[PDB]
Amino acid sequence: PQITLWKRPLVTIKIGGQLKEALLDTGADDTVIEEMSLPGRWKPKMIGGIGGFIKVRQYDQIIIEIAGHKAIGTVLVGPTPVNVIGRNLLTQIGATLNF
Amino acid sequence: PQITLWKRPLVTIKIGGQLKEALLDTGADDTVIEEMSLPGRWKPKMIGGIGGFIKVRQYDQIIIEIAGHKAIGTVLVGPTPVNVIGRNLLTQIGATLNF
Ligand SMILES: CC(C)(C)NC(=O)[C@@H]1C[C@@H]2CCCC[C@@H]2CN1C[C@@H](O)[C@H](Cc1ccccc1)NC(=O)[C@H](CC(N)=O)NC(=O)c1ccc2ccccc2n1
Ligand SMILES: [Cl-]
Numbered sequence: 001p002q003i004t005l006w007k008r009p010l011v012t013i014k015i016g017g018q019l020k021e022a023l024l025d026t027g028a029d030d031t032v033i034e035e036m037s038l039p040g041r042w043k044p045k046m047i048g049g050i051g052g053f054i055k056v057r058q059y060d061q062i063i064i065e066i067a068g069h070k071a072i073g074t075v076l077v078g079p080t081p082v083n084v085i086g087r088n089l090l091t092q093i094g095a096t097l098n099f
Numbered sequence: 100p101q102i103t104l105w106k107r108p109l110v111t112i113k114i115g116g117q118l119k120e121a122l123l124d125t126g127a128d129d130t131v132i133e134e135m136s137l138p139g140r141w142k143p144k145m146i147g148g149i150g151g152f153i154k155v156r157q158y159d160q161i162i163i164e165i166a167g168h169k170a171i172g173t174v175l176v177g178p179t180p181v182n183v184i185g186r187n188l189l190t191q192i193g194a195t196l197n198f
């Protein structure tokens with residue numbers, strides 16, 4: 001699709017058999033999702049956003065569908081008011097910004 | 100242009116007479132620029148994201164040239180580590196996400 005930006009670019013994602021809404025975010029290096037169980041071990045990570053840094057749980061090689069496109073990659077889990085799909089997975093679904 | 104997302108989507112902007120680099124950020128509602136003076140009236144605002152909130156100055160009707168394309172709108176000025184071009188101005192240059 002071609003998504004305009006008059007509204008937030010929110011799409012459905014599927015992770016763990018569950019549907020969630022998430023933001024397609026060209027400004028995010030990483031993908032950050034609300035607290036949720038994921039399989040396997042996690043590693044520590046600090047990420048910085050507009051208000052400061054937070055600690056998150058880094059899970060690698062997680063299967064996630066994004067707007068019907070399959071990705072398998074790193075998902076950070078931590079406190080965020082919005083689930084964010086960052087460039088690590090936007091590249092896997094072939095997303096570009098155009099004007 | 101078509102901008103791939105392997106790297107941060109940084110472009111040159113001109114604002115307040117000044118050339119700067121900024122991030123094309125589909126996950127930002129607002130345009131947030133590093134501390135600088137702008138002409139006219141402003142009012143305080145709090146904006147948030149991961150990590151919490153910051154206090155900003157809101158200037159309305161500010162012109163910014165973004166990768167050669169003029170846009171006008173509200174620009175927030177405050178303690179951001181990165182200049183962010185958010186949706187309020189990305190719409191004005193006709194930017195879309197495509198996959
Ligand atoms: C996700 C993460 C990997 C941590 N990356 C980032 O956060 C980088 C950090 C960079 C340096 C600091 C300044 C911002 C830039 C760009 N951001 C990406 C950037 O796209 C970031 C992603 C985001 C969206 C929504 C909610 C939280 C987080 N957007 C934002 O921070 C913008 C700022 C704004 N305009 O007010 N926030 C929002 O647009 C926004 C939307 C809904 C909300 C609901 C409740 C609470 C807060 C909400 N904030
Ligand atoms: Cl990844």
Ligand SMILES: [Cl-]
Nearest residue numbers: 171172173187
């Ligand atoms: Cl505006």
Ligand SMILES: [Cl-]
Nearest residue numbers: 004005190193
């Ligand atoms: Cl349009």
Ligand code: NA
Nearest residue numbers: 040059060061
């Ligand atoms: Na894993």
Ligand code: NA
Nearest residue numbers: 139140159160
């Ligand atoms: Na003004």
